């Protein structure tokens, strides 16, 4: 009965001072990815919005961020492009912290753009990776 | 707001040109090319100055036999790095 | 046009890469602390808007800063390098941390991390209960707040 909203609110409102038992129900949550169509897209947008948030410490957000990035190519490309763009825009405020993440995301997005015979978009996406002006 | 906050941060950073050298000003070819002279008729390398301008070694050799100044900044040329 | 609150009193020394002997010779992968990321982003934007065609390489081993303790008995303010500040910031989760947590948070190299740990032990900021601080898997460091400072500056520089 819409308990997902209550769980999400409790999780972000949680202090999480322990952090030692988070692994169990984060691995449980990891396999809970397939939510059919638009529900999956909304859930992934909410997840990345909650993990982009400033209050989350930069010790576990990066690891699950790369794990979600590697889980992303399993999705169909049509929605994969949209979620890649959305997470690129959401990580845009904090790029210097997430450099591996943006690099991998842009590489995957450029690949899927190239497989669509769209060279301009793929080249522009690959350009956005900071290779000299990067930390 | 936190338990152990940060007040001040004295940062130190180094700035550098995004593209230092990409073409010899004399031959107009790329600095990794054959200086246009070795290209038409043949080791080609870079020769920097005290201004760090990085022309082709052969191109700056040909330029120096007529003019004593750097092509770009028009100052007295002194060799540095090779 | 939009209000910018860095949360940090920011002062920087931007130096020529070619002129200065300093360089990013070490392969340190030091992860930036999250509190002062806004400062570096704002200054990178300012430098891009001001000087075109340049890039910035922050020397994370030469920048220092002040961390203030005010609710732990008001023990004045400490001044430490960013390497010595990332570990203190990671100590915010709890009084005792492991080497794995520091490795995952600061993302520093083994040599730099061990140097920071040794310098902290010289300060006696953190300590080990036993003599197991050697190369192992536990590395159970802990706080030593009972050994409060005597001066206020506590300006370590060597
Ligand atoms: Zn030339
Ligand atoms: Zn030549
Ligand atoms: Zn010159």
From Swiss-Prot, chain A:
* Subcellular location field: Cytoplasm; Nucleus; Cytoplasmic vesicle, Secretory vesicle, Synaptic vesicle
**Superkingdom of this entry's organism?**
Eukaryota
Sites of N6-acetyllysine modification: 24
Annotated positions of the N-acetylalanine modification: 1
Record note on quaternary structure: Component of the CSN complex, composed of COPS1/GPS1, COPS2, COPS3, COPS4, COPS5, COPS6, COPS7 (COPS7A or COPS7B), COPS8 and COPS9 isoform 1. In the complex, it probably interacts directly with COPS1, COPS2, COPS3, COPS5, COPS6, COPS7 (COPS7A or COPS7B) and COPS8. Interacts with TOR1A; the interaction is direct and associates TOR1A and SNAPIN with the CSN complex. Interacts with STON2; controls STON2 neddylation levels. Interacts with ERCC6.
Please give the function described in this protein's UniProt entry.
Component of the COP9 signalosome complex (CSN), a complex involved in various cellular and developmental processes. The CSN complex is an essential regulator of the ubiquitin (Ubl) conjugation pathway by mediating the deneddylation of the cullin subunits of SCF-type E3 ligase complexes, leading to decrease the Ubl ligase activity of SCF-type complexes such as SCF, CSA or DDB2. Also involved in the deneddylation of non-cullin subunits such as STON2.
Q: Which family does it belong to?
A: Belongs to the CSN4 family.
| Protein name as it appears in the record | COP9 signalosome complex subunit 4
Give the organism, scientific name: Homo sapiens (Human)
Which gene holds the coding sequence for this protein?
A: COPS4
UniProtKB/Swiss-Prot annotation, chain B:
**Annotated tissue distribution:** Widely expressed.
Q: Which parts of the sequence bind Zn(2+) 3?
A: 51, 53, 70, 73
Detail which positions bind Zn(2+) 1. Answer: 24, 27, 56, 59
Q: Which residues bind Zn(2+) 2?
A: 35, 38, 44, 58
An example Gene Ontology biological process:
spermatogenesis
| Zn finger intervals (RING-type) | 35-74
Q: Where does this protein act, in terms of pathway?
A: Protein modification; protein ubiquitination; Protein modification; protein neddylation
Q: What is this enzyme's catalytic activity, as reactions? A: S-ubiquitinyl-[E2 ubiquitin-conjugating enzyme]-L-cysteine + [acceptor protein]-L-lysine = [E2 ubiquitin-conjugating enzyme]-L-cysteine + N(6)-ubiquitinyl-[acceptor protein]-L-lysine; S-[NEDD8-protein]-yl-[E2 NEDD8-conjugating enzyme]-L-cysteine + [cullin]-L-lysine = [E2 NEDD8-conjugating enzyme]-L-cysteine + N(6)-[NEDD8-protein]-yl-[cullin]-L-lysine
Question: What Enzyme Commission number does this protein have?
Answer: 2.3.2.27, 2.3.2.32
Subunit architecture? Component of multiple Cul1-RING E3 ubiquitin-protein ligase complexes commonly known as SCF (SKP1-CUL1-F-box) complexes, consisting of CUL1, SKP1, RBX1 and a variable F-box domain-containing protein. Part of a SCF(SKP2) complex consisting of CUL1, RBX1, SKP1 and SKP2. Part of a SCF(FBXO3) complex consisting of CUL1, FBXO3, RBX1 and SKP1; this complex interacts with PML via FBXO3. Component of the SCF(Cyclin F) complex consisting of CUL1, RBX1, SKP1 and CCNF. Identified in a SCF E3 ubiquitin ligase complex together with HINT1 and CDC34. (Microbial infection) Interacts with human adenovirus 5 protein E1A; this interaction inhibits RBX1-CUL1-dependent elongation reaction of ubiquitin chains by the SCF(FBW7) complex.
The family classification in the record reads: Belongs to the RING-box family.
UniProt note: domains: The RING-type zinc finger domain is essential for ubiquitin ligase activity. It coordinates an additional third zinc ion.
What is the name of the protein in this document? Answer: E3 ubiquitin-protein ligase RBX1
Organism listed in the record: Homo sapiens (Human)
What gene, per UniProt, encodes this protein? RBX1
Question: Which residues of the complete protein appear here?
Answer: 19 to 106 of 108
From Swiss-Prot, chain C:
Going by the UniProt record, its keywords in alphabetical order are: Acetylation, Host-virus interaction, Isopeptide bond, Nucleus, Phosphoprotein, Ubl conjugation, Ubl conjugation pathway
Q: Any idea what job this protein has?
A: Core component of multiple cullin-RING-based ECS (ElonginB/C-CUL2/5-SOCS-box protein) E3 ubiquitin-protein ligase complexes, which mediate the ubiquitination of target proteins. CUL2 serves as a rigid scaffold in the complex and may contribute to catalysis through positioning of the substrate and the E2 ubiquitin-conjugating enzyme. The E3 ubiquitin-protein ligase activity of the complex is dependent on the neddylation of the cullin subunit and is inhibited by the association of the deneddylated cullin subunit with TIP120A/CAND1.
In the record, the effect of residue 124 to R is given as: No effect on conjugation with NEDD8
Protein known as: Cullin-2
Cite a GO CC annotation: SCF ubiquitin ligase complex
Q: Where in the cell is it found?
A: Nucleus
Please report which protein family the annotation says this sequence is part of.
Belongs to the cullin family.
**Among the record's GO biological process terms, what is one?**
intrinsic apoptotic signaling pathway
Post-translational modifications reported in the UniProt record: Neddylated; which enhances the ubiquitination activity of ECS (Elongin BC-CUL2/5-SOCS-box protein) E3 ubiquitin-protein ligase complexes. Neddylation leads to structural rearrangment in the complex that allows interaction between the E2 ubiquitin-conjugating enzyme and the acceptor ubiquitin. CBC(VHL) complex formation seems to promote neddylation. Deneddylated via its interaction with the COP9 signalosome (CSN) complex.
Which GO molecular function, any one, fits this protein according to its record? protein-macromolecule adaptor activity
Taxonomic lineage of the native organism: Eukaryota, Metazoa, Chordata, Craniata, Vertebrata
Domain description: The Cullin neddylation domain restrains the RING domain of RBX1 in the E3 ubiquitin-protein ligase complex; this restraint is removed upon neddylation of the cullin.
Question: In terms of one coarse class, where is the protein primarily found?
Answer: nucleus
Q: Please, which domain of life does this record's source organism belong to?
A: Eukaryota
């Amino acid at each position: 009965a819409a308990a997902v909203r209550q769980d999400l609110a409790q999780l972000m409102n949680s202090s999480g001072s322990h952090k030692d038992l988070a692994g169990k129900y984060r691995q449980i949550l990891e396999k809970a990815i397939q939510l059919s169509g638009a529900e999956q897209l909304e859930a992934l947008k909410a997840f990345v919005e909650a993990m982009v948030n400033e209050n989350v410490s930069l010790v576990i957000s990066r690891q699950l961020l790369t794990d979600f990035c590697t889980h992303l190519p399993n999705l169909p490309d049509s929605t994969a492009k949209e979620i890649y763009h959305f997470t690129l825009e959401k990580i845009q405020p904090r790029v210097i912290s997430f450099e591996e993440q943006v690099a991998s995301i842009r590489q995957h997005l450029a690949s899927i753009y190239e497989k669509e015979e769209d060279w301009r978009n793929a080249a522009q996406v690959l350009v956005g990776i900071p290779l000299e002006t990067g930390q | 707001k936190k338990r152990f906050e940060v007040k001040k941060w004295n940062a130190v950073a180094l700035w550098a040109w995004d593209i230092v050298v990409d073409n010899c000003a004399i031959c107009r070819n790329h600095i990794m090319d054959l200086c246009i002279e070795c290209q038409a008729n043949q080791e080609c390398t870079v020769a920097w100055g005290v201004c760090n301008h990085a022309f082709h070694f052969h191109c700056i050799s040909r330029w120096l036999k007529t003019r004593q100044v750097c092509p770009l900044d028009n100052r007295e040329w002194e060799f540095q790095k090779y | 046009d939009t209000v910018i609150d860095l949360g940090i009193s920011f002062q920087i020394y931007v130096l020529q890469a070619g002129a200065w002997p300093l360089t990013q010779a070490p392969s340190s992968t030091f992860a930036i602390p999250q509190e002062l990321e806004k400062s570096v982003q704002m200054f990178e934007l300012f430098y891009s808007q001001h000087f075109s065609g340049r890039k910035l390489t922050w020397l994370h081993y030469l920048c220092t800063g002040e961390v203030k303790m005010n609710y732990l008995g008001k023990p004045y303010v400490a001044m430490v390098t960013t390497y010595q500040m990332a570990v203190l910031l990671a100590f915010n989760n709890s009084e005792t941390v492991s080497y794995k947590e520091l490795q995952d948070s600061t993302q520093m190299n083994e040599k730099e991390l061990t140097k920071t740990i040794k310098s902290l032990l010289d300060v006696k900021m953190i300590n080990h209960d036993s003599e197991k601080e050697d190369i192992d898997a536990e590395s159970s460091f802990s706080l030593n707040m009972n050994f409060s400072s005597k001066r206020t500056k506590f300006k370590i520089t060597t």
